[PDB]
Write a protein that binds this ligand. Structure first.
Ligand SMILES: C=C(C)c1ccccc(=O)c1O
Ligand SMILES: C=C(C)c1ccccc(=O)c1O
Ligand SMILES: [Zn+2]
Ligand SMILES: [Zn+2]
Lengths: 346, 341
């Protein structure tokens, strides 16, 4: 199928173009302000489907006029919004005079990667500014925004292309509409930034937050994709926290130099998992009231997880000639009021 | 203080004993069935606080009778469940008596195939043994041993938890057998699917730690699946529906991996052993951005959407990278496109 995308260099166009050329065999005719009038016409008259992303307005009228001479009666997709609605009745009359299926959508504000900041998306501007430690302006935190993520826009458009749009009360409607306050948005973005300092992760079964997180990351300066962890270092090795959550535990990285033993503690309720990913050694266990010592000989050649059960004192020792690197998951963030850690030599 | 724990070899006793000797300077007098009558009496008459764990009955009456001759009028703590007489004792001899009404209890060090159905389920389930559930809808009322211990320590210091004028251990749980069993089978099945329990659910958190204490000594570890080839390996470690997934990538010397991008999926790389480079290119651009990283200096590299990226080992040894991804792999939305940086 020959698919024309007008406004193809825009936020949505670029997203759609990349997707269609990645996931279909359709011939994409990009139209934009560098297109010559000849190639606009040529493309329109060959078209099977027209995805119109530029405004309603004189440009569209011109595109529509050319399409009256396209003998295949290609379907046309556009959005009438800008919160005002323009041109709708005229476009229904066009569809009915010339036959073309015309899908009029009423897209709300949009967000996602590749949207130009300091232009006409407030979320692009907040992401851009916040990632660059630039001051933002929030007149009122309680303003509600109605939003669609670009992936859903793209997917709804693809569904229309293959003849199965999403209809609601007799109107094409992209799903996964989000209704959120500015204050909730801004708070999430500042949270994403602060997480490089506190190691926390977003809540990724919240669809809006998930979408916004990926969006925010696309605005990072090229020089800013990495960030330092805090390596607590001494002549025994190091210990470095990587990620913390309130509900799925915390992962850290322990490193022990040759000949080094660490640990010799137990808890009542706190528990861990060790996974040795480089080097070799031994994890030892003893029941607080017993003398039986249980040893697990482990190494990065064979990845196995060792649960650290409660009520056992345990230590970990490097038995090789290189650094021994262990990933260490713990069931809960450290709480100064309930450290739940007791020193006892295995 | 001199603190007597009757029934000290029991489930609660052993828990309490280990805690008190770990977090206080108090002199603990364990009494139990190996205590001689002389040592019972001696200990009781010296006592400042009596934590009675053997429950009500002729044994307790005998303990109470001895304590009428303890000049210091020590406080006494017990649980009446399985009363008026004990209120009358307190009022005749002066001693502060805390009557609790503990429901069923669970936690580590409880003897299985005995008096605790949760101990039995943990024990059995960890050993791949058949369990009996007559009715899944039976509701159990429960306290975790840590809360029992803590409430007792609070009473020792003179500040118990009172409700409707009765000592009550908090964090009472009300749960069906079916919910308990389903969580335990889940904990086991997680060794196969890499998932983690929901640890801001207090009961599930407590139960998870409890379950782990029942693992056979030979069963503390479990294999991960190392997808291995001549380039290295890739091994999933942990998966969650809400905080992403962590895996371990290993590349041999000279090896490049990746050269893909996503729309919405994203990752974090953390090189913990060896050294190399993580590369990035915007899908519509030619600018290649490179991050030179190694295990000598732990830094996280976010993998942002809309950039194709690869990772290459530039050293002598295996290059070990921990890789967090924002979502479990979904066959209907793999959201991964091959593109050479
Ligand atoms: C709980 C931590 C941070 C830790 C760290 C290093 C080595 C052995 C341990 O058992 C351990 O618990
Ligand atoms: C998403 C995974 C599993 C992965 C694994 C190895 C190397 C490089 C990658 O970019 C990567 O995405
Ligand atoms: Zn530990
Ligand atoms: Zn990747």
């Amino acid at each position: 199928m020959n698919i024309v995308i007008t406004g193809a260099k825009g936020f949505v166009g670029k997203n759609l173009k990349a997707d269609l050329t990645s996931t279909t065999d359709h011939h994409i005719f990009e139209v934009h302000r560098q297109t010559k009038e000849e190639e606009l016409e040529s493309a329109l008259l060959k078209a099977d489907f027209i995805v119109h992303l530029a405004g309603v307005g004189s440009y569209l009228d011109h595109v529509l006029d050319i399409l009256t001479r396209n003998t295949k009666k290609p379907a046309i997709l556009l959005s009438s919004s800008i919160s005002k609605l323009q041109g709708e009745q005229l476009l229904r009359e066009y569809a009915e005079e010339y036959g073309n299926t015309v899908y009029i959508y009423r897209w709300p504000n949009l967000f996602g990667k590749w949207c130009k900041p300091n232009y006409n998306s407030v979320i692009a501007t907040f992401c851009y500014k916040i990632a660059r430690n630039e001051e933002i302006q929030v007149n009122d935190r309680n303003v509600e925004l109605t939003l669609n993520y670009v992936d859903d826009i793209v997917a709804e458009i693809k569904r229309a292309i293959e003849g199965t749009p999403t209809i609601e009360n007799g109107v094409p409607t992209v799903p996964n509409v989000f209704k959120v306050t500015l204050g909730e948005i801004v708070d999430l973005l500042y949270k994403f930034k602060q997480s490089r300092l506190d190691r926390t992760l977003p809540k990724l079964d919240n669809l809006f937050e998930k979408d916004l997180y990926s969006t925010y990351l696309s605005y990072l300066p090229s020089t800013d994709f990495s960030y330092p962890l805090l390596m607590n270092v001494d002549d025994r090795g190091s210990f470095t926290e990587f990620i913390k959550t309130p509900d799925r535990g915390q992962v850290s990285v322990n490193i022990s130099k040759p000949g080094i033993t660490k640990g010799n503690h137990w808890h009542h309720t706190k528990n861990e998992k060790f996974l040795v990913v480089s080097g070799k050694g031994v994890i030892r266990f003893r029941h607080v009231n017993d003398d039986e010592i249980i040893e697990y000989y482990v190494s990065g050649d064979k990845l196995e997880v060792v649960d650290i059960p409660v009520g056992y004192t345990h230590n970990i020792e490097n038995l090789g000639d290189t650094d021994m690197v262990t990933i260490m998951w713990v069931n809960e963030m450290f709480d100064p009021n309930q450290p739940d850690t007791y020193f006892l030599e295995v």
